[PDB]
Amino acid sequence: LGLREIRVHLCQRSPGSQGVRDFIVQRYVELKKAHPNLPILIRECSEVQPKLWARYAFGQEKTVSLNNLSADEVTRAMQNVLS
Amino acid sequence: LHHAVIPHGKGGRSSVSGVVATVFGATGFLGRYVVNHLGRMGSQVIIPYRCDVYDIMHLRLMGDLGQLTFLEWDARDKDSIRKAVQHSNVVINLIGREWETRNFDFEDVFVNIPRAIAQASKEAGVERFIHVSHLNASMKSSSKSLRSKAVGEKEVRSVFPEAIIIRPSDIFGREDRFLNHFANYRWFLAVPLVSLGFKTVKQPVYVADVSKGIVNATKDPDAVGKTFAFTGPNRYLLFHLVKYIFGMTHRTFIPYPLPLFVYSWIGKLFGLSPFEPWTTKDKVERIHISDVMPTDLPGLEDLGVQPTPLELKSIEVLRRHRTYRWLSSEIEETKPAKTVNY
Amino acid sequence: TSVKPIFSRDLNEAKRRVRELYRAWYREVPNTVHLMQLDITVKQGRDKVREMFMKNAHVTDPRVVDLLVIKGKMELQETIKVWKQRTHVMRFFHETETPRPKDFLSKFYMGHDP
Amino acid sequence: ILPGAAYTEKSATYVNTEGRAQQTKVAVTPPGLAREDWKIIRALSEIAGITLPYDTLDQVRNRLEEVSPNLVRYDDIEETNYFQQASELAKLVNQEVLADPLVPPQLTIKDFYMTDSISRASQTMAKCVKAVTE
Amino acid sequence: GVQVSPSGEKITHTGQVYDEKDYRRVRFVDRQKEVNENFAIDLIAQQPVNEVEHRIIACDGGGGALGHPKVYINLDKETKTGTCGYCGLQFKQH
Amino acid sequence: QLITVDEKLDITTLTGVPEEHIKTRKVRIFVPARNNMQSGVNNTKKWKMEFDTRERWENPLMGWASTADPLSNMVLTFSAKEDAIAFAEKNGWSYDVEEKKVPKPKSKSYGANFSWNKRTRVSTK
Amino acid sequence: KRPTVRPRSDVTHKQLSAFGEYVAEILPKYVQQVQVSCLDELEICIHPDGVIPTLTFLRDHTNAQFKSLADLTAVDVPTRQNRFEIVYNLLSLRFNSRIRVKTYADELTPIDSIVSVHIAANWYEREVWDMFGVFFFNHPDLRRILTDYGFEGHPFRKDFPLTGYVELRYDDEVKRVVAEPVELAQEFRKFDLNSPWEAFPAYRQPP
Numbered sequence A: 001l002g003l004r005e006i007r008v009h010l011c012q013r014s015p016g017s018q019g020v021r022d023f024i025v026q027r028y029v030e031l032k033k034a035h036p037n038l039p040i041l042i043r044e045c046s047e048v049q050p051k052l053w054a055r056y057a058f059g060q061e062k063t064v065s066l067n068n069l070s071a072d073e074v075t076r077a078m079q080n081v082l083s
Numbered sequence B: 001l002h003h004a005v006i007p008h009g010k011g012g013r014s015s016v017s018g019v020v021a022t023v024f025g026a027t028g029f030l031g032r033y034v035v036n037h038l039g040r041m042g043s044q045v046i047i048p049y050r051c052d053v054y055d056i057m058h059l060r061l062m063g064d065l066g067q068l069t070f071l072e073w074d075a076r077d078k079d080s081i082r083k084a085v086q087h088s089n090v091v092i093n094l095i096g097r098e099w100e101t102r103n104f105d106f107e108d109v110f111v112n113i114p115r116a117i118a119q120a121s122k123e124a125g126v127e128r129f130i131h132v133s134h135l136n137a138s139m140k141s142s143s144k145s146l147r148s149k150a151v152g153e154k155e156v157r158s159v160f161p162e163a164i165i166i167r168p169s170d171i172f173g174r175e176d177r178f179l180n181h182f183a184n185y186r187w188f189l190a191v192p193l194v195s196l197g198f199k200t201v202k203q204p205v206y207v208a209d210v211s212k213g214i215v216n217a218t219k220d221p222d223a224v225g226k227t228f229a230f231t232g233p234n235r236y237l238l239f240h241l242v243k244y245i246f247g248m249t250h251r252t253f254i255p256y257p258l259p260l261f262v263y264s265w266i267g268k269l270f271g272l273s274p275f276e277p278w279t280t281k282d283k284v285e286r287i288h289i290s291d292v293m294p295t296d297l298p299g300l301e302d303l304g305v306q307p308t309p310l311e312l313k314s315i316e317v318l319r320r321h322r323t324y325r326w327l328s329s330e331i332e333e334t335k336p337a338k339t340v341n342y
Numbered sequence C: 001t002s003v004k005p006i007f008s009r010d011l012n013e014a015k016r017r018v019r020e021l022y023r024a025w026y027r028e029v030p031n032t033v034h035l036m037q038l039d040i041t042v043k044q045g046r047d048k049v050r051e052m053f054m055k056n057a058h059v060t061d062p063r064v065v066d067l068l069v070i071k072g073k074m075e076l077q078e079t080i081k082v083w084k085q086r087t088h089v090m091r092f093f094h095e096t097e098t099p100r101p102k103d104f105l106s107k108f109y110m111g112h113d114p
Numbered sequence D: 001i002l003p004g005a006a007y008t009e010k011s012a013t014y015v016n017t018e019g020r021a022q023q024t025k026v027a028v029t030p031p032g033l034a035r036e037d038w039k040i041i042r043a044l045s046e047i048a049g050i051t052l053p054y055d056t057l058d059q060v061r062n063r064l065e066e067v068s069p070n071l072v073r074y075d076d077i078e079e080t081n082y083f084q085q086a087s088e089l090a091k092l093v094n095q096e097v098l099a100d101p102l103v104p105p106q107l108t109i110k111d112f113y114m115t116d117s118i119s120r121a122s123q124t125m126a127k128c129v130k131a132v133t134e
Numbered sequence E: 001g002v003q004v005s006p007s008g009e010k011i012t013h014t015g016q017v018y019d020e021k022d023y024r025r026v027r028f029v030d031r032q033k034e035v036n037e038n039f040a041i042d043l044i045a046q047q048p049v050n051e052v053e054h055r056i057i058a059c060d061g062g063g064g065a066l067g068h069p070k071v072y073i074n075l076d077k078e079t080k081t082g083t084c085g086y087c088g089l090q091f092k093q094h
Numbered sequence F: 001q002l003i004t005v006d007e008k009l010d011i012t013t014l015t016g017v018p019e020e021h022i023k024t025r026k027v028r029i030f031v032p033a034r035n036n037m038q039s040g041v042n043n044t045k046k047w048k049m050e051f052d053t054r055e056r057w058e059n060p061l062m063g064w065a066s067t068a069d070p071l072s073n074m075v076l077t078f079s080a081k082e083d084a085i086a087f088a089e090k091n092g093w094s095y096d097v098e099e100k101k102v103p104k105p106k107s108k109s110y111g112a113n114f115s116w117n118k119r120t121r122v123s124t125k
Numbered sequence G: 001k002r003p004t005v006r007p008r009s010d011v012t013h014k015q016l017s018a019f020g021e022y023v024a025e026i027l028p029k030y031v032q033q034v035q036v037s038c039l040d041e042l043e044i045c046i047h048p049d050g051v052i053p054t055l056t057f058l059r060d061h062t063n064a065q066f067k068s069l070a071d072l073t074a075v076d077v078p079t080r081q082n083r084f085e086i087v088y089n090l091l092s093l094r095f096n097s098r099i100r101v102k103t104y105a106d107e108l109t110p111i112d113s114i115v116s117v118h119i120a121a122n123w124y125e126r127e128v129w130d131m132f133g134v135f136f137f138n139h140p141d142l143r144r145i146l147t148d149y150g151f152e153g154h155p156f157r158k159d160f161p162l163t164g165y166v167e168l169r170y171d172d173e174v175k176r177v178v179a180e181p182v183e184l185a186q187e188f189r190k191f192d193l194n195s196p197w198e199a200f201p202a203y204r205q206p207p
């Protein structure tokens, strides 16, 4: 029911990961300040479709497939999971 | 839990299961199969024996290098029991004979010895002690054997609490004394029965199902103070059971009435033979005792063994009683017996 | 791709051979049980024949199926004649091995197997 | 007490300081009734109603893939970045370093040989401590 | 030089014995655990330490080809006594 | 003639290995590491293929090490990684590959031992 | 002079080398890589489809009367995609020479039989099948010759464990010899004996 921790996957140089990587350098700083006790376990792999895994109260994981989503498009996608 | 006893391997020979066992009836008929299922997996079975070293020869199979240790003992003589039940973890007492000898009564084979094994095991420090009685082991009984086992069952438990009292029905098998008995009545032109066999119900059980039950009784954490009754399915009627034995053993079937008073005295005559008698007054009564229902006891299903029907595993033992012109017949041509819930 | 054939133009043609070999076994179970004194009944013998086929029903390579059929005929030849005795025929039924469990918890209790 | 298996007794994925995931491989089966570390939690789940999904080891590696892709990549190092963002969030806090000299616990070689349960239990490592101090 | 363990069992020259509670002791019931009573630690110590003139002395089993490979010991140490590696003999000088 | 077959080559049923050693078993394709005690590199150059180790226990009688699996002792040598992979997939075993670890060429000069201003100066000989 | 090194009769190297070429250009459709070893023995590698023409030729031809089939072996090499390298050793009794003929195979690529040409192959011809699983076309009987009647395996394949997958023992529960998975009492001790030094520089394989 209540969000416990988010985690995001993305590549280094893959063009598909663009937008996730543009997201961090603009909106990551603001969010963590807004939610000090919400671990956003961002992890950076080599080749992987970007994902936004979310963890909830009991055993429950909802995930998206935010591949080739613009930087602003990620902002709404994750803001959806927060609310 | 000594590190040696800890189980190991995938289960089989050359393995360890921590079931160091002293079987006191290995030389017999049920003991052969109990040792096999202990030795098939990894178990060091100590086999006390008094017979010839030749009669125990067939038991040197069914066990890896040094998984068997043969020791001598005399039931009357104390201090040979303790020497055998000392290091064991489970003691399986299968001692039992169906007739009196010059030295041993039924009291001295069903009551005294189990007490000596039981007392010598509790002091020794065994964890379990599996005992075998008969299902019809009521004190209010007619057979001399069944009544003695009733006292032995109570006396074993009093000395050694938390014993496992196994109560099989009449066990049938290859070298048995149930199907090999009725099938041997052909040597007389007919098969005498009491009341043509009606009013008597038998619930035979296969040996492997019994031995599987005994072997799993030394593993399952529960069943440490319980009393089982390995009956098996398909309660046949003695007339229908014997008629079926001759159905597989394509010989004949000429049952006729016979009072139990004459059919016991004739049986008492065969009991005079110095050798293994063919029949005895006590075996006449056991064959003609209705088997109680298993309702108020756990049984095989509550222990992890599937009872095996008689029709499936009857040709294995009754083939040797067939003659040429009937040796190659199969299970299909027998019209199996009819079960009765009476 | 581009592999020479062996007694099979395509899978359907090789399925006919398997169906030909099955008809050879189903007609044979009732003769072995009697010719050599087996303790099984014919009804359950044919079940094992069918079971040994479903063990290999997931294969789709035409070449593999032909080799499976070739071996089966050899297995049948050794049984049509009594070259393989009661010891060998009853080896398929696995009447002694303990049924290996499937539940993970049962595997965890005994042994280190996965 | 639920006995597990040591690092020489089970296939496990350890990540080192560089972030380079590496795989142990079984050399000796664990002694006695000890079982693999991850098997106990899976078995412990099934007794309760938690019923953890994955059954065998290869499925647990699939689970590690979802939680963190880098773990399953063996002998591969991820060119991590984004240290700027961590530094910017670091400067926000208003804590002051204590006015006390910092001294590592390991100042002399005698403290090297006893630092873990495995080394502590060993008798060779205990010989070295006896030799060094003496 | 055989010593009996508290359980009454005989300890071999390798120091082995089965505990009182070990089930593997059954094999010795009605039989015996043969142990060689001529230990090797004790017998080699009862030999006298040989004294030689050189600082490097050879050692072989004694018969030449019937002994052990030709080795050379260094006898400069005075606190200890040089020991042949194959046979447990000892050498000193002076 | 020829046939069309796009399905991956698969001969698990022909070799007749029991199913208990097909799915569960794991295969390791690697180039064995040089025994660091020796400085020769002949043990390498050949891709090997072991199997996942299984339980070994002391025999209750002699203390010998007894096993319950037949594949433990088997090691197969291959010329190149690609050939080993085909064998693993062809027989249906699961496989994992550890990439070759060849030493990086190093610049050893006897003259660096005796340098006028660098720190490479060896203090002995 | 050199009592250790074997005497080298180089005459029989020239004779074999001349004959290998003679066979090479008199049967080009199949012949591949004829070679002669130090030990003066010829070796002809044949495309598998040419086994009958090559073996029939080398028997009937007047200048090559190889009528005796010494043996028909098979070498398993998992490295190469065509594993099984069937070998034919032949003998003449006329020219007093031995010639080896080699072809490749695979567990899904059978080879034509030779019992038509050399009846000696018949039993050797099954032995390969029983031990390597190399099916052979046009053979009359073709059944296992060596292994038990119930091996679902091919023992000489390098992927077959030495101890095997099954052991036989006697059981009283069923009163017949039964088969159970193998559990050795003492595991076979594989000795890693290979030395890490180039014993033979003449066979170096550059990277």
Ligand SMILES: NC(=O)C1=CN([C@@H]2O[C@H](COP(=O)(O)OP(=O)(O)OC[C@H]3O[C@@H](n4cnc5c(N)ncnc54)[C@H](OP(=O)(O)O)[C@@H]3O)[C@@H](O)[C@H]2O)C=CC1
Pocket: B024, B025, B026, B027, B028, B029, B030, B031, B050, B051, B075, B093, B094, B095, B096, B097, B098, B104, B108, B109, B132, B133, B134, B135, B168, B169, B170, B171, B177, B178
């Ligand atoms: N129908 C059945 O078979 C039934 C069997 N049971 C129980 O099963 C157990 C064994 O069945 P089964 O084996 O068929 O009977 P057996 O007579 O075949 O087994 C006899 C065993 O007991 C030993 N034994 C008998 N008397 C003595 C004695 N006085 N001193 C020492 N050892 C002795 C025998 O040793 P030796 O070989 O030297 O005689 C042999 O090992 C018995 O306890 C019996 O009550 C229960 C119900 C019915």
Ligand SMILES: [Zn+2]
Pocket: E059, E060, E061, E068, E084, E085, E086, E087, E088, E089
């Ligand atoms: Zn010496």
